[PDB]
Amino acid sequence: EEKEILWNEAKAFIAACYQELGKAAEVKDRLADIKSEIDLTGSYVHTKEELEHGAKMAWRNSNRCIGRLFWNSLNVIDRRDVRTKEEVRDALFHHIETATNNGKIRPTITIFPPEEKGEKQVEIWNHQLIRYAGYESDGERIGDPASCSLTAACEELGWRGERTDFDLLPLIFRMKGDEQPVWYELPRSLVIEVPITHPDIEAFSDLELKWYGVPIISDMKLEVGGIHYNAAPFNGWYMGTEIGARNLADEKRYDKLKKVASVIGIAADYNTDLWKDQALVELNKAVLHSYKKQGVSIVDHHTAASQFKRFEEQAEEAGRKLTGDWTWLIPPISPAATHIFHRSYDNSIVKPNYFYQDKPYE
Numbered sequence: 001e002e003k004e005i006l007w008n009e010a011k012a013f014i015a016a017c018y019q020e021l022g023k024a025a026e027v028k029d030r031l032a033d034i035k036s037e038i039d040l041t042g043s044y045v046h047t048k049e050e051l052e053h054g055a056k057m058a059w060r061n062s063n064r065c066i067g068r069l070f071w072n073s074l075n076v077i078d079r080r081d082v083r084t085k086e087e088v089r090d091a092l093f094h095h096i097e098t099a100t101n102n103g104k105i106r107p108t109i110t111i112f113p114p115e116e117k118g119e120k121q122v123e124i125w126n127h128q129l130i131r132y133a134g135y136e137s138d139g140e141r142i143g144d145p146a147s148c149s150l151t152a153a154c155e156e157l158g159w160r161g162e163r164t165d166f167d168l169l170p171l172i173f174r175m176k177g178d179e180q181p182v183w184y185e186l187p188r189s190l191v192i193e194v195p196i197t198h199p200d201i202e203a204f205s206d207l208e209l210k211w212y213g214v215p216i217i218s219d220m221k222l223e224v225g226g227i228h229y230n231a232a233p234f235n236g237w238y239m240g241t242e243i244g245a246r247n248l249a250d251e252k253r254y255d256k257l258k259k260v261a262s263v264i265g266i267a268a269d270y271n272t273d274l275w276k277d278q279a280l281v282e283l284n285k286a287v288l289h290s291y292k293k294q295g296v297s298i299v300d301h302h303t304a305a306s307q308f309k310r311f312e313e314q315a316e317e318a319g320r321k322l323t324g325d326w327t328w329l330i331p332p333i334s335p336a337a338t339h340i341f342h343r344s345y346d347n348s349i350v351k352p353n354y355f356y357q358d359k360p361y362e
Ligand code: HEM
Pocket: 055, 059, 062, 064, 065, 066, 067, 068, 070, 074, 107, 108, 109, 234, 235, 236, 237, 238, 239, 242, 299, 304, 328, 354
């Protein structure tokens, strides 16, 4: 019905992939074998080398990612062999442990079986594997507002949170052929967390802030040569502004800037005092200090943009077009102090790539 879309994606991908692996001679025979396989079966199966390089290409093509200099060192874990809930659960546990690496974070992706002919083999409900619950009741707000809808789905299924501001959500996923997902609590031994302190202001610890070490995005689809890997969680390390300027600062997230102003001893009364700006800087200083003192990988937005400049230079030196989303590449703190702010970027979509997909809860 729709097999030729798959076949053409497969030609573009195999051509480009082998080219770069210095293997263009093997292309003609590999496309033959693929053409056979699609006719008989309706799909094809990537080699380990094709899958690893495809997931690396997909990171290199992610327009919104400032961290792409390191695209070629992605650790790719091939879990297309899993068939049971316990195997999925244990592969997700293993990803956390091996990506964390005692604080010296390793960018890692774990790839589960792809969609067969539209049908998902495994459907992950978490937005990240490690994330905090959020609650809204009696006009009383607890934890992370961005997690309210998933937290309510989890509690229909029999999970119950302690209603701290930092409850760890359970892993939640559904297998092909079950009506309902299963959930598993995270073993705390697997989860590194960082208390937020400030290098100079001893009272900052009175805020009792913390964040988790590793962001493991678990709800995006990886597409490589026409095959759709809807379950393929991946992680880098944080850039500090993600925690200090957004997760802990936004009014619709933890909304901590007024409390920060008070502990650093400035008034939060007049826009012209730039008290929100000053609080943002001190919170973001505290976040970088805290991760570094605990030995957990993190990058500041200036170093990150320096790395991205080198990515842009490599792309040219290799003859590849650069694509990028200016509105996501600029950092939310001092953007005009980076080179990114002062140039433009072509936002075209190149494949392999990571894509959004509809959430299964509401
Ligand atoms: C190694 C360290 C990494 C750093 C520091 C980094 C940094 C970032 C940042 C700051 C964003 C913006 C998110 C926001 O505004 O909150 C982002 C987006 C993104 N990153 Fe990276 N990243 C890294 C690794 C990775 C890896 C390993 C992949 C996949 C293999 C990846 C794929 C993406 C994608 C797809 C987006 C866009 C997500 C969306 O549209 O919602 N990144 N990255």
